[PDB]
Amino acid sequence: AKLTSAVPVLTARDVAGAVEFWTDRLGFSRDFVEDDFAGVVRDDVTLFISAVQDQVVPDNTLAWVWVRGLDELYAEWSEVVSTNFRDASGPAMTEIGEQPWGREFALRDPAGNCVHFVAE
Amino acid sequence: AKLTSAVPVLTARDVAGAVEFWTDRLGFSRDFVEDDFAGVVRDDVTLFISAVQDQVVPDNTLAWVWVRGLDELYAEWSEVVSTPAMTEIGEQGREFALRDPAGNCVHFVAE
Numbered sequence: 001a002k003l004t005s006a007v008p009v010l011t012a013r014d015v016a017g018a019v020e021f022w023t024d025r026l027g028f029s030r031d032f033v034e035d036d037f038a039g040v041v042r043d044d045v046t047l048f049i050s051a052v053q054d055q056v057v058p059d060n061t062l063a064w065v066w067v068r069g070l071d072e073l074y075a076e077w078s079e080v081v082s083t084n085f086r087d088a089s090g091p092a093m094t095e096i097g098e099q100p101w102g103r104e105f106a107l108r109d110p111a112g113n114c115v116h117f118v119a120e
Numbered sequence: 121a122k123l124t125s126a127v128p129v130l131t132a133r134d135v136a137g138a139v140e141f142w143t144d145r146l147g148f149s150r151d152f153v154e155d156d157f158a159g160v161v162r163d164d165v166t167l168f169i170s171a172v173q174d175q176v177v178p179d180n181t182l183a184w185v186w187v188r189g190l191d192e193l194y195a196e197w198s199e200v201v202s203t204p205a206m207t208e209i210g211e212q213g214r215e216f217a218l219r220d221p222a223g224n225c226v227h228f229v230a231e
């Protein structure tokens with residue numbers, strides 16, 4: 001057999017709001033959207049979004065995404081996402097950092113999930 | 121830019137035990153292991169595992185994985201996991217789901 005790809009599942013109390021942010025703001029496309037679950041895609045990456053009732057879940061939900069052209073993606077999103085991450089009143093992203101595992105930045109979405117984007 | 125691959129982050133109150141399950145029982149390899157975070161890998165798929173203090177998180181954590189040879193993977197795991205536990209294979213793609221010791225539920229779908 002061969003395991004070929006994986007799809008992280010972000011969580012949210014407001015599923016429709018999460019889909020709108022990932023698509024209308026970050027440029028992912030809607031693969032499918034149901035009231036309690038959805039799938040969004042950009043290039044070879046699909047992210048699912050699932051409904052939850054306890055905010056503790058997205059508050060502890062993470063995902064990692066590998067990217068060719070990290071600075072370009074950061075530039076695009078910097079136009080529409082705040083870089084004041086310590087202000088958790090809304091979505092925001094960090095600056096690019098050089099972590100042991102790679103050059104990356106992270107973005108906290110409106111639901112609270114933290115998705116890290118790392119340069120290939 | 122191009123988004124090339126994604127890595128789901130499973131959650132666990134016991135990261136080491138989750139690593140033990142995914143590697144010894146499910147046949148993933150250890151990519152790296154720290155007390156509060158770890159990475160396991162099989163073929164092109166890497167799963168990260170992060171520590172949490174609230175069991176509600178893994179009890180609501182999901183991930184999907186695509187596979188060539190779904191029936192072979194099911195047969196391999198049916199020798200080490202109760203049918204942690206896994207569902208039967210059913211048509212939705214064709215898939216089965218597996219709940220790990222930490223509570224995460226990962227679905228495996230046939231390409």
Ligand SMILES: [Cl-]
Nearest residue numbers: 062106114115
């Ligand atoms: Cl984080």
Ligand SMILES: [Cl-]
Nearest residue numbers: 140141144145
């Ligand atoms: Cl063992």
Ligand SMILES: [Cl-]
Nearest residue numbers: 182217225226
């Ligand atoms: Cl489920």
Ligand SMILES: [Cu+2]
Nearest residue numbers: 059060062114
């Ligand atoms: Cu944190």
Ligand SMILES: [Cu+2]
Nearest residue numbers: 179180182225
């Ligand atoms: Cu369920």
